[PDB]
Design a protein around this ligand. Structure first.
Ligand code: HEM
Length: 184
């Protein structure tokens, strides 16, 4: 089950975060034992498309090759805290699994600057358990976590040493599909 009421960044700059560009997950922390593989690739685009706040997600397990995209419509709960639906889509935005009640995630931006961010998400999918996830993001897929984001991890009373890096997994991303999925 999820247990964290993540606190959004003071003074969060929504237009800078939701600028239409891509964020790569460089490190992740799942608080639920065996919720996450040990090796993963994930990225997201975030932007406003025709007045609607959107995310597009990509997940890839580099061992199994399991791959899926989602597009998400975000509703605002407060500054930097959202509830997102999700429909599963192919990389061109064709619907595979429609939006349905009880498929949603919460999404909280705990820290962000122009290049890095720390987020929390609680995924609810049907009758699946939930679970908390933290992710360190960067605009550069190859960037080591720096001092602004590692300090934010400590300020959230977390240990960065507990986070699992995605860097040793040869992750390759279709940035074009993530950007175009924002419109879908
Ligand atoms: C970047 C932030 C992330 C968000 C917002 C997020 C959101 C989601 C959503 C919405 C789904 C369900 C998709 C669908 O069924 O259509 C999902 C599934 C999944 N995510 Fe994430 N995810 C994120 C990052 C990650 C990371 C970094 C990992 C682990 C390394 C991870 C592991 C998983 C796994 C294993 C599933 C499959 C769950 C299942 O159906 O049994 N996710 N995620």
């Amino acid at each position: 089950a999820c247990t964290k009421n993540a606190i959004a960044q003071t003074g969060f700059n929504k237009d800078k975060y939701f600028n239409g560009d891509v964020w790569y997950v460089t490190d992740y922390l799942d608080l639920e034992p065996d919720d996450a593989p040990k090796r993963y690739c994930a990225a997201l685009a975030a932007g406003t498309a025709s007045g609607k706040l959107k995310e597009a997600l990509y997940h890839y397990d580099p061992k199994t090759q399991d791959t899926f995209y989602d597009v998400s419509e975000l509703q605002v709960e407060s500054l930097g805290k959202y509830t997102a639906n999700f429909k599963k889509v192919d990389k061109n935005g064709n619907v595979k699994v429609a939006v349905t009640a009880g498929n949603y995630y919460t999404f909280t931006v705990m820290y962000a600057d122009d290049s890095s961010a720390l987020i929390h998400t609680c995924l609810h999918k049907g009758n699946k358990a939930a679970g908390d996830l933290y992710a360190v993001l960067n605009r550069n897929k190859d960037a080591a976590a720096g001092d602004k984001v590692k300090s934010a991890v400590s300020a959230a009373t977390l240990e960065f040493s507990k986070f699992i890096s995605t860097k040793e997994n040869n992750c390759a991303y279709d940035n074009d599909s993530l950007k175009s999925l924002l419109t879908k």
